[PDB]
Amino acid sequence: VQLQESGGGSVQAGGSLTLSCTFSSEYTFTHNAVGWFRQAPGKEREGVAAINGGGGSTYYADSVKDRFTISRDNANTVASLIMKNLKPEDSGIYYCATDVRLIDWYSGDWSLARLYSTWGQGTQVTVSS
Amino acid sequence: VECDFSPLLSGTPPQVYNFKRLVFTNCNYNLTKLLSLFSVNDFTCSQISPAAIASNCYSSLILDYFSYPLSMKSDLSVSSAGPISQFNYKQSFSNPTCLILATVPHNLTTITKPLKYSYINKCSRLLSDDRTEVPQLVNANQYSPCVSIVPSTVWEDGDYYRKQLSPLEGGGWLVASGSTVAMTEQLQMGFGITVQYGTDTNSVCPKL
Ligand SMILES: *[C@@H]1O[C@H](CO[C@H]2O[C@H](CO)[C@@H](O)[C@H](O)[C@@H]2O)[C@@H](O[C@@H]2O[C@H](CO)[C@@H](O[C@@H]3O[C@H](CO)[C@@H](O)[C@H](O)[C@@H]3O)[C@H](O)[C@H]2NC(C)=O)[C@H](O[C@H]2O[C@H](CO)[C@@H](O)[C@H](O)[C@@H]2O)[C@H]1NC(C)=O
């Protein structure tokens, strides 16, 4: 494949998890971007954070600002999501995505899932009260 | 379908003599979406205006882009009295055009910087008499006749290049030289726009 999420698991409310989006050894997002999304039962897929190659631009959903931090390695092969003070409603399958339509990504549409052509298989995040 | 200007935002922009050309047809465009991402330092047009180029319907829109230092703005103003229009980049005389000089804000880290700025300062044919040089200049809307012998980035200021021509081609040599300008803290670029109001319907229209 090309995108692989890792780092999900079960955690008590208020705890933390760090997710990793690892690119296949031949790929990079140096000239593109990575978005982190999540999917909960009965809700539409929701962008939570995104970052571009080189890290010049970072975006966060209002629902996660001041609790989530997205980061990259220098080579733009891993995008990490540090999630702190987790809540039960943060439970979901979390996906990373890349190969985004960059002009729209930079122009306020970073959270639009349809802009991303390449999606990982997702990792499970289970937050318990 | 919205014309997608994303290629400008991804990768290392070539030098002026290797300008990257994108041709748009049958799509709707939003020029301010592109330009709002940059710090625009200069925006000049011929046979059209900045207001009009953003708001008209065309049979085709052609977008050129390249790395270009703002300190060489005057080398554009001298036109064919200087090396940029003589040997690197000269826009159409036949269709309306604009030329934009912009600085890449720090946020657009997906646009990666070349090691330096380079341009061609000489392109000439050295004739089979091994004596007279005949300058070979760029035609409007085309690439330099020396693009095949100048590297994508000039290694050292004043580097000189040559290629033997066959007897069938008239003999002698094609010769060129390159100049460099130090890279800037933020990358600076040129965008060239050419539009055509053609027989083909004007189906490149502003997005509403
Ligand atoms: C696009 O870039 C803007 C400027 O980024 C510069 O700084 C980074 C380092 O942070 C360089 O790597 C980069 O090359 C460029 O020089 C961002 O705006 C800046 O954001 C930073 C951090 O968010 C601000 O710095 C902090 O300011 C607080 C204020 O109290 C201070 O306590 C901290 O100690 C720290 O210094 C900085 O002030 C700000 N400057 C400007 C001119 O905006 C921008 O993201 C930031 O700004 C957004 C609007 O201000 C804001 O909404 C974001 O939360 C973020 O703070 C960035 N845009 C994107 C999309 O990433």
For chain A, the domains span 3-128
CB B125 within 8 A of CB B69: no
Task: Give the distance from CA B159 to its chain's centroid.
Answer: 21
Answer whether A17's CB lies under 8 Å from A6's CB.
Answer: no
CA distances (Å), B28 to each of A47, A112, A113, B134, B137, in order?
Answer: 27, 20, 22, 45, 35
Find the angle CA(A2)-CA(A67)-CA(A108) to the nearest 5 degrees: 60
Mapping DSSP to helix (H, G, I), strand (E, B) and coil, where does residue B64 land? strand
Q: Is B94 on the interface with A (CB under 8 A)?
A: no
Residues B167 and B203 in one domain: no
Alpha-carbon span B181 to B169, nearest angstrom: 34
The domain in which residue B96 lies consists of 1-115+183-207
> How many CB atoms sit inside 10 A of residue B188's CB?
25
Give me the CATH number covering residue B26: 3.30.70.1840
Number of residues that make up chain B: 208
A3-128 sits in which CATH class? mainly beta
Breakpoints of chain A, after residues (C–N > 2.5 Å): none
Nearest chain B alpha carbon to A32: B110
The answer to whether residues B151 and B164 belong to one domain is: yes
Instruction: Work out the burial of residue A114: count CB atoms within 10 Å of its CB; fewer than 13 is exposed, 13-18 middle, 19 or more buried.
Output: exposed
- Residue pair A104/A54 in contact (Cβ under 8 Å)? The answer is no
Q: Please check whether residues B193 and B153 belong to one and the same domain.
A: no
Q: Are B77 and B59 in a shared domain?
A: yes
Query: If you take atom 59 of ligand 1, which residue's CA is the nearest one?
Result: A57
Resolution in A: 1.9
Contact B107, B4 (CB under 8 A): no
What is chain B's percent helix, strand, coil content, to nearest 5? 15, 35, 50
Residues B106 and B164 in one domain: no
A23 alpha-carbon distance from chain centroid: 13
SS3 string of chain A? CCEEEECCEEEECCCCEEEEEEECCCCCCCCCEEEEEEECCCCCCEEEEEEECCCCCEEECCCCCCCEEEEECCCCCEEEEEECCCCHHHCEEEEEEEEECHHHHHCCCCCCHHHEEEECCCEEEEEEC
The binding-site residues of ligand 1, defined as CB within 6 angstroms of any ligand atom, are: A 57-59; B 106-107
A105–chain B nearest CA distance, Å = 10
Instruction: Note whether B12 and B70 are same-domain residues.
Output: yes
Q: Which atom of ligand 1 is nearest to the CA of B107?
A: 1
Residues 6+ positions from A21 with CB-CB distance below 8 Å: A3, A4, A5, A34, A36, A78, A79, A80, A81, A96, A120
Q: Which of residues 24-43 of B touch A (CB under 8 A)?
A: 33-34, 36-37
What token pair was written down for A68? 């989530």
- How many angstroms separate the CA atoms of B81 and B90, rounded? 12
Residue in A32, A54, A103 nearest the CB of B33: A103
Q: Do A32 and B112 touch (CB under 8 A)?
A: no
- Residue B93 Cα to chain centre, angstroms: 15
Q: What is d(CA A71, CA A78) in angstroms, rounded to the nearest whole number? A: 8
Do B139 and B197 have their domain in common?
no
B5 neighbourhood in chain A, CB within 8 Å? 103
Residues B90 and B173 in one domain: no
Residues B153 and B197 in one domain: no
Q: Cα angle at B150 between B145 and B155, to 5 degrees? A: 160
CATH code, domain with B121: 2.20.210.30
Residue labelled with tokens 């289970």: A126
Tokens linked to A37: 């999304």
Residues B141 and B152 occupy one common structural domain:
yes
Total of domains in chain B: 2
